[PDB]
């Protein structure tokens, strides 16, 4: 089976240099073009360019060329796109896909994808915050929590609520890059309002990236 | 560049009935030499890499289900579902992969037709504990609604507020095809604290009228 692996997630300060790489197996890598796509974080997907790792060819779109260098080393079956200089609009998911020319038969099969976030911001675990039910937050027998996982850096949390026992009507927000530099999301559930100061509502949250775990009773 | 363009943005669909996708492209992708047009279709699931369902206009990429077929000519190309499927949800590109640079659409979100579900909207004082650290986060939650499309203002003392809330959506619930949204509003405690009354205000198809949800600080 053909496949294309690309090379772990990054964080990076701006004007860092930064260089990702896309490994290919099962198949002759010379052969076929190395594409280059990046997605912004909520956005669409952007051609950036291709190498032919057998001639070293290159195309770039205009976009693109200046600020990155597309290259490939063909004794290791490896494409890479780099970085002299990151700027924080650099911070993206970046794709690298297998191709003919042009892409002209399409790009058939892709890298799992390489996550570039760039931010002058340093390691830090969340604070979390009761969203507490009231009266302002019950309608019709059900009443909604939840918790404010504000202020951490990088992505991701985790958040699972009793310790896993409850997962009927949470929602569990996407991460929002506040004014700061640095992540906020909610985690919600809605339940019934009878319940409200008899059984325990606990949500548990996990930020790998600074070990920070905490544990936040929601009471009204 | 090539522009391609797609219409529409984003396409209901009840599973079970035919959908299609237009791409149009500013300049024709019909080669001279062999007569076939060089237009891709690819979907993207929600937190995958993309996938390629059809090349060269009306090609179907090996593993792609026959529900796909493309069709059009030159400038103009339409990718059609003949029967949608649930798994079939997620944001479908087109690209021109005739002259470089490859340039992608801006891309189509097929998402579940439902019934329209009013938004459930609960707002959140800041905790006590944020309070005492020096901050105010006010949430306002819309749960359970359907369709996407929703407009939330701020409004503080009756004053129009800009610039200091972000908001949330959740992917299409697996379970009952609705979204939820969270506004949270973002002040400092001594900001929070020159003001009484703290209001959501939220537009939904839903909704005969626009409706607040609203506190007095410190009840």
């Known amino acids: 089976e053909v496949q294309l692996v690309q090379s772990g997630a990054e964080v990076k300060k701006p004007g860092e240099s930064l260089r990702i790489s896309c490994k290919g197996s099962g198949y002759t890598f010379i052969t076929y073009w190395i594409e280059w796509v990046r997605q912004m974080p909520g956005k669409g997907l952007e051609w950036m360019g291709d190498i032919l790792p057998g001639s070293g060819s290159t195309n770039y779109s205009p976009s693109f060329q200046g600020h990155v260098t597309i290259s490939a080393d063909k004794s290791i079956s490896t494409a890479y796109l780099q970085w002299s200089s990151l700027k924080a609009s650099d911070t993206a998911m970046y794709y690298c896909?297998?191709?003919?020319?042009?892409?002209?038969?399409?790009?058939?099969?892709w890298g799992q994808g390489t996550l570039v976030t760039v931010s002058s911001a340093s390691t830090k675990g969340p604070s979390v915050f009761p969203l507490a039910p009231s009266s302002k937050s019950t309608s019709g027998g059900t009443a909604a929590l939840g918790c404010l996982v504000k202020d951490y850096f990088p992505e991701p949390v985790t958040v699972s609520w009793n310790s896993g026992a409850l997962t009927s009507g949470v929602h569990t927000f996407p991460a929002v890059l506040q004014s700061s530099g640095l992540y906020s999301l909610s985690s919600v559930v809605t339940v019934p309002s009878s319940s409200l100061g008899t059984q325990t509502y606990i949500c548990n949250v996990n930020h790998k990236p600074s070990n920070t775990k905490v544990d936040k009773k929601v009471e009204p | 560049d090539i522009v391609m363009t797609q219409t529409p943005l984003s396409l209901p669909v009840t599973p079970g009935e035919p959908a299609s996708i237009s791409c149009k492209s500013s300049?024709?992708?019909?080669?001279?030499?062999?007569?076939?047009?060089?237009l891709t279709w690819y979907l993207q699931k929600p937190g995958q890499s993309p996938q390629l369902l059809i090349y060269?206009?009306?090609t179907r990429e090996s593993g792609v289900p026959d529900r796909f077929s493309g069709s059009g000519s030159g400038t103009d190309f339409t990718l059609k579902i003949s029967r949608v499927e649930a798994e079939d949800v997620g944001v479908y590109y087109c690209?021109?992969?005739?002259?470089?640079?490859?340039?992608f659409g801006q891309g189509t979100k097929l998402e579940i037709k439902r019934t329209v579900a009013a938004p459930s909207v609960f707002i959140f004082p800041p905790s006590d504990e944020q309070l005492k650290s020096g901050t105010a986060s006010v949430v306002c939650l819309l749960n359970n609604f359907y369709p996407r499309e929703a407009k939330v203002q701020w409004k503080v003392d009756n004053a129009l507020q800009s610039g200091n809330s972000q908001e949330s959506v959740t992917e299409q619930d697996s379970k009952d095809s609705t979204y939820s949204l969270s506004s949270t509003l973002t002040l400092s405690k001594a900001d929070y604290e020159k003001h009484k009354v703290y209001a959501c205000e939220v537009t939904h198809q839903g909704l005969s009228s626009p409706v607040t949800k609203s506190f007095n600080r410190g009840e």
């Open positions: 060269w206009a009306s």
């Open positions: 690209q021109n992969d005739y002259t470089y640079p490859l340039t």
């Open positions: 896909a297998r191709s003919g020319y042009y892409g002209n038969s399409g790009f058939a099969y």
């Open positions: 300049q024709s992708l019909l080669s001279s030499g062999n007569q076939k047009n060089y």
